[PDB]
């Protein structure tokens, strides 16, 4: 058992940190990316210099260029591509996977048609074992072997046990959660809230203001969760509160960093280019905002961020309207 | 509605900041301190240099060193002393209470004997109208007039109305909350968690580990709240989550800096001497630990902090036992 290789699709910081966690335990890992130049860098250097420098790949970790090749002999797939590319990657996997394929993901966000990612998986690939991994997990700290805890929700007990067996260790811990819907929804909203708190911090509004915004953030996250059938227990757990407090308060949080630039008057284009990766917060804002309108759900922080990005709303004015009811 | 002066007992940073919020709106405020040389300093200088320097008093804010004098002609009182001094202050107020006295407090933590603050107030002074104000509110940021939001819970609708009317405003916002007990209990645990998360940071265990500990912290805070009849809505609100995130992540938190020192290897005695002014987290830990044990309440973080303080438990081992959970 646990001899079959595992494929991880997406070589951003988190996909790579997860590949490392597994590869270090001697498990064979195949790391694929649709960015060909990046794969060339990884194959040539044996490290992921553009997203996670200073952490060489162990021997059991190899970068792949060809999706088919990375999945040959693999039954368990862990997807960590950006939310905007999830549907496209699933579509590409459709004729490559087989009957016993099991699908997990660490991607956070919604897909076209305002759908939770598991629905995209189900529609395209049929009813298969599925799992979502999510919690407070800065990729650099995981890479550095600092203590970390995440939640894992699945529709299949054996798959959940198997994933936990692969990942769960002394310093990287994975706890079962039976609420996939709630884990997905909390994960799709937390980056949006971190942009908002980043904006507040950029405006130098203070620690008190940030704490208030975080509290209001969890309230709207909670509303979204309840409307779709998630559990309030998820809200106060690692996938909700945990990931939210980390992402809204840490200097290593890129979504917060982006918000902070906006708060300091940097335009969104220049702000993203300066950061250099994928600010999921931008994509998540649009995804969640559309879902909230489709279902007429009140989500004030999310709505203000969306106005800031698409209607030239002044950051100062935006935050002021939020704190002052 | 503000013909009469309001008295604020406790001239620490927070008490003084609250006094400024009110006095700046033109309300008459009397600020009392039990440190007598302290009132002389404030009367002479027109500022609280010991605890909130750089924020001069408006004309309507006056310091008093006599408790009786501060309460003469005043029926609304707002207590903001440390939890370890609450009992003493309530005791001294006994001969000064009148028929319409109303008592609010900004103090956080259990009083002597592991007593809830409203119980000390009700048992010792009678069942007077009571209220608690609690939320993420660094005193320095409030003095600077930066946006702040806090909860206010009361056992009397008229008192709630009157307090919110006095305090609520543009940058300092006060939201009605129906759960005094939940608000109190949340506030009595947050500094214990600040010490715990401070220790993890002192050990440089990282931001992921801190978030995991904050998450676990809220779980035991919820258990305590639940056992005394408080509400989950309070737990995820300003008095629970809000104040917890602020206190577990800020440089300004003295309880967190104390924890940082412990995590770095400093002994508790030297760590507190270096800080200088008394902190409440150790006292809070001891009172809550006693309460948890009296009622068989499981609170793992609080118990580990207690072990670190009183059983010589090594900090690294302590945090690794907390994180390496089943």
UniProtKB/Swiss-Prot annotation, chain A:
Pfam families: NAD_Gly3P_dh_C, NAD_Gly3P_dh_N
Record key words, sorted: Cytoplasm, Lipid biosynthesis, Lipid metabolism, NAD, NADP, Nucleotide-binding, Oxidoreductase, Phospholipid biosynthesis, Phospholipid metabolism
Top EC group: oxidoreductase
GO molecular function, one term: NAD binding
Residue positions binding sn-glycerol 3-phosphate: 108, 135, 137, 190, 243, 253-255
Positions that bind NADPH: 13-14, 108, 139, 254, 280
Subcellular location, principal: cytoplasm
Record's function text: Catalyzes the reduction of the glycolytic intermediate dihydroxyacetone phosphate (DHAP) to sn-glycerol 3-phosphate (G3P), the key precursor for phospholipid synthesis.
Name the UniProt record assigns to this protein: Glycerol-3-phosphate dehydrogenase [NAD(P)+]
Annotated organism of origin: Coxiella burnetii (strain RSA 493 / Nine Mile phase I)
Origin organism lineage: Bacteria, Pseudomonadati, Pseudomonadota, Gammaproteobacteria, Legionellales
Swiss-Prot record, chain B:
Domain of life: Bacteria
Key words of the record: Cytoplasm, Lipid biosynthesis, Lipid metabolism, NAD, NADP, Nucleotide-binding, Oxidoreductase, Phospholipid biosynthesis, Phospholipid metabolism
Location within or outside the cell: Cytoplasm
Binding site for NADPH: 13-14, 108, 139, 254, 280
Keyword Metal-binding: no
Pathway: Membrane lipid metabolism; glycerophospholipid metabolism
Group of enzyme by EC: oxidoreductase
Function comment: Catalyzes the reduction of the glycolytic intermediate dihydroxyacetone phosphate (DHAP) to sn-glycerol 3-phosphate (G3P), the key precursor for phospholipid synthesis.
HAMAP family named in the record: NAD_Glyc3P_dehydrog (MF_00394)
Family of this protein: Belongs to the NAD-dependent glycerol-3-phosphate dehydrogenase family.
Protein name: Glycerol-3-phosphate dehydrogenase [NAD(P)+]
Organism in which the protein naturally occurs: Coxiella burnetii (strain RSA 493 / Nine Mile phase I)
Origin organism lineage: Bacteria, Pseudomonadati, Pseudomonadota, Gammaproteobacteria, Legionellales
Gene behind this protein: gpsA
């Amino acid at each position: 058992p646990f001899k079959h290789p595992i494929a991880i699709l997406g070589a951003g910081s988190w996909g790579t940190a997860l590949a490392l966690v597994l590869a270090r335990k001697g498990q064979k890992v195949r790391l694929w990316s649709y960015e060909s130049d990046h794969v060339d860098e990884m194959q040539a250097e044996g490290v992921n210099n553009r997203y996670l420098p200073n952490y060489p790949f162990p021997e059991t970790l190899k970068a792949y260029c060809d999706l088919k090749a990375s999945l040959e002999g693999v039954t368990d797939i862990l997807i960590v591509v950006p939310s905007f590319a999830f549907h496209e990657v699933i579509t590409r996997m459709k004729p490559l996977i087989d009957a016993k394929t099991r699908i997990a993901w660490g991607t956070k966000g919604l897909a076209k048609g305002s759908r939770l990612l598991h629905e995209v998986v189900a529609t395209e690939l049929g009813q298969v074992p599925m799992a979502v991994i999510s919690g407070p997990s800065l990729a650099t700290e995981v890479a550095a072997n600092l203590p970390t805890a995440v939640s894992l929700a699945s529709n299949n007990s054996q798959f959940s046990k198997d994933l936990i067996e692969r990942l769960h260790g002394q310093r990287f811990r994975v706890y079962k959660n039976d609420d996939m819907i709630g884990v997905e929804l909390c994960g799709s909203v937390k980056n949006i809230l971190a942009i908002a708190t980043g904006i507040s911090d950029g405006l130098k509004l203070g620690s008190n203001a940030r704490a208030a915004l975080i509290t209001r953030g969890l309230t709207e996250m909670g509303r979204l969760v309840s409307v779709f059938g998630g559990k309030q227990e998820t809200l106060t757990g690692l996938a909700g509160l945990g990931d939210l407090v980390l992402t809204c308060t840490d200097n290593q949080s890129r979504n917060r960093r982006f918000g902070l630039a906006l708060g300091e008057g940097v335009d969104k284009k220049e702000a993203q280019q300066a950061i250099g990766q994928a600010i999921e917060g931008l994509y998540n804002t649009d995804q969640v905002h559309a879902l909230a309108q489709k279902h007429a759900i009140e989500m004030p922080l999310t709505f203000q961020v969306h106005r800031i990005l698409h209607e030239d709303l002044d950051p100062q004015q935006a935050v002021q309207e939020l704190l002052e009811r």
